[PDB]
């Protein structure tokens, strides 16, 4: 898979950066969240503990997928802002 960064925007009020990206992958399954996160943190030099993937979406007859992720500068701000379900679904925390 080949990843292309479309936009990186700064949100100082929330204290995060919001990242939109595309993945090109003809003849392959939709990439997993773990692989995308590893590639993204390598590509941008992020602490992976505060990197959350909002979504990965595939389309009808396409060889590429579109994705959205967020990166917080502070762990406590992430736990205070983000909903519980997305942090569990991303393996950041454990479901009780």
């Amino acid at each position: 898979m080949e990843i292309k960064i479309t936009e990186v925007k700064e949100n100082k009020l929330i204290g995060r950066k919001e990242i939109y990206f595309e993945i090109y992958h003809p003849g392959e399954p939709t990439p997993s969240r773990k692989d995308v996160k590893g590639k993204l943190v390598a590509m941008l030099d992020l602490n992976p503990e505060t990197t959350v993937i909002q979504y990965i979406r595939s389309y009808f007859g396409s060889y590429k997928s579109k994705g959205y992720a967020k990166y917080y500068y502070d762990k406590d701000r992430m736990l205070y802002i983000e909903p519980e379900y997305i942090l569990i679904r991303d393996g950041i925390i454990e479901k009780k």
Partner: protein, 242 residues
């Protein structure tokens, strides 16, 4: 409403001046009573969430508001139902930006970027004027607010004049009269968002409102209601307008 006030608002019945997707959901925010009226303002949640995009959901928009990050006319506003209207200034100091709320050529509300210096002043059209106890004068403005002046000043203010006010201190610094040759900006009606100079003023019997003729820059003359014509300068604008 069979027995009491309405507290809800369907999206399909929302005001026509908002930028809102009318079929995406069932409900819209019912704005709280406040400064402007329903036809000339919009709740602050749509500014934070829908217009600027600083938040994705209502819950995190409320957390941004409660921490005190948004200023309206120089004052902290935390209520997500607060109405924001024509000629207000929206300020974000943590990002250092400022906007003036103004209507479109189609009659919809938009945000016009301005300088930091110009953000200190708000023009206020004089809607009504009255005597008050102690024999003083109360001025009632277009955004619902009020000011007091002494009886010696009674000849320097009349209805339809504009007062430039320093906010949030609320101190007068200039009075702009309504007369021929003044510069005006239209705020409602078919000719909304057009601007120019005053040529003539006409009156009628039995309480029908009075009408004004205005010459634009390219030299065309058009008419509108007098109360739709908002004075903004002497012969040049005193604020930045698109």
């Amino acid at each position: 409403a069979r027995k009491g006030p309405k507290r809800h608002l369907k999206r399909l019945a929302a005001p026509t001046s908002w930028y809102i997707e009318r079929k995406a959901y069932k409900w819209a925010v019912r704005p709280r009573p406040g400064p402007h009226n329903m036809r000339t303002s919009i709740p602050l949640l749509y500014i934070v969430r829908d217009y600027l995009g600083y938040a994705k959901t209502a819950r995190e928009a409320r957390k941004i508001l409660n921490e005190g990050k948004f200023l309206v006319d120089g004052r902290v506003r935390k209520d997500y139902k607060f109405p924001v209207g024509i000629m207000d200034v929206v300020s974000i100091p943590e990002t250092g930006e400022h906007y003036r709320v103004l209507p479109n050529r189609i009659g919809k509300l938009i945000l016009h970027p301005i300088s930091e210096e110009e953000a200190n002043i708000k023009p206020l059209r004089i809607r009504n004027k009255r005597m008050v106890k102690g024999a003083k004068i109360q001025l009632n403005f277009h955004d619902g607010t009020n000011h007091l002046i002494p009886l010696s000043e009674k000849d320097n203010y009349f209805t339809s004049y504009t007062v430039l006010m320093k906010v949030p201190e609320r101190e007068i610094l200039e009075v702009l009269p309504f007369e021929k040759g003044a510069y005006v900006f239209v705020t409602q009606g078919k000719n909304v968002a057009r601007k120019g100079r005053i040529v003539e003023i006409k009156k009628f019997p039995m309480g029908w409102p009075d009408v004004v003729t205005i010459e634009d820059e390219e030299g065309e003359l058009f008419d509108t209601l007098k109360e739709y014509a908002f004075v903004v300068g002497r012969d040049k604008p005193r604020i930045s307008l698109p």
